[PDB]
Amino acid sequence: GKRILLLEKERNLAHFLSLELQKEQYRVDLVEEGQKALSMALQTDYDLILLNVNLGDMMAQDFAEKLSRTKPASVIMILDHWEDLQEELEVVQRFAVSYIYKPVLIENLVARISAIFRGRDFI
Numbered sequence: 165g166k167r168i169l170l171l172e173k174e175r176n177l178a179h180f181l182s183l184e185l186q187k188e189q190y191r192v193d194l195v196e197e198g199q200k201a202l203s204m205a206l207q208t209d210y211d212l213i214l215l216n217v218n219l220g221d222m223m224a225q226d227f228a229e230k231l232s233r234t235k236p237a238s239v240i241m242i243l244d245h246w247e248d249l250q251e252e253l254e255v256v257q258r259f260a261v262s263y264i265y266k267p268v269l270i271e272n273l274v275a276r277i278s279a280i281f282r283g284r285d286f287i
Contacts, residue, residue, distance in 0.1 A: 167191045168211065169201060170192055171196065171215050172215075193208075198221040202227055202230055209235075211281065213238060216244050242256050242262075242264070243268070245265065261280065262276075
């Protein structure tokens, strides 16, 4: 029953991930622009925000810094390819509670999301 904000650049993954999360009775707001994601996260208290390292119109780090001005310690997880995460890993470790490497099956990603809500960064 948690609320998730989702910005994912691969449209297939974004769509089918949102459907599976909804099947698990999560409320999912799927967005396609970083600035829209930031507006939404400022307005609404999400239980998890799921992003790539680069949102398109800004980096996830920029999103987190701006969100932190009024909502420090928001719960952000980063999903991305190994290379993309590795190049930014030290900074991601400063603003994200968790990160997951692509490619990942939707069922496993949903399992990891559920587990985070239970206080466990693993399945």
